[PDB]
Amino acid sequence: MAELTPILPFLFLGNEQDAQDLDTMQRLNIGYVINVTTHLPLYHYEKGLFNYKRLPATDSNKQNLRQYFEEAFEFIEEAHQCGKGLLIHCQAGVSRSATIVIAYLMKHTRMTMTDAYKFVKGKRPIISPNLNFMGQLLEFEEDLNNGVT
Numbered sequence: 281m282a283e284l285t286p287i288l289p290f291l292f293l294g295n296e297q298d299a300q301d302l303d304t305m306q307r308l309n310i311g312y313v314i315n316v317t318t319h320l321p322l323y324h325y326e327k328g329l330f331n332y333k334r335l336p337a338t339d340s341n342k343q344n345l346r347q348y349f350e351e352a353f354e355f356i357e358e359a360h361q362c363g364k365g366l367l368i369h370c371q372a373g374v375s376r377s378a379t380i381v382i383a384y385l386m387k388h389t390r391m392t393m394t395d396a397y398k399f400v401k402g403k404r405p406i407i408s409p410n411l412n413f414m415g416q417l418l419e420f421e422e423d424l425n426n427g428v429t
């Protein structure tokens with residue numbers, strides 16, 4: 281049922297239904313969760329098992345996700361530093377969460393935007409398109425190449 285896609289051995293991508301499989305998350309040694317929605321609950325919050333961060337974003341043609349990139353990168357590095365996995369999820373098409381993942385692959389693994397997309401698309405086959413998010417990833421790639429971010 282639940283597919284917590286490992287983009288990297290410690291970085292996982294999923295949707296709303298994936299984020300509710302508590303046993304798999306604990307078996308995968310996940311200790312950090314990034315919820316990239318305004319309206320979904322922080323699943324399992326009252327159990328005190330994970331560190332949470334909500335990026336309150338919608339899946340629209342006007343939503344600004346670039347503003348949250350640097351905040352999400354620090355949370356991922358914090359999980360990376362202590363040997364724990366991080367799950368980033370949103371909803372069915374994983375448009376929002378896949379944008380943050382690709383951006384991290386561009387920033388921390390030095391993948392190009394295109395190669396990062398093919399990397400994620402190969403492991404997570406169902407990704408809904410968002411031209412607004414594609415444009416932001418393109419602007420982010422140029423800023424990386426110009427050493428501006």
Ligand SMILES: CC(C)(C)C(=O)CSc1ncc2ccc3ccccc3c2n1
Pocket residue numbers: 374375376378379382393394397407408409410411413414417
């Ligand atoms: C941004 C987000 C991850 C939410 C998506 O929009 C995925 S959907 C899609 N569909 C057709 C494409 C064709 C070329 C391409 C080059 C670079 C990056 C993405 C694409 C591409 N992306």
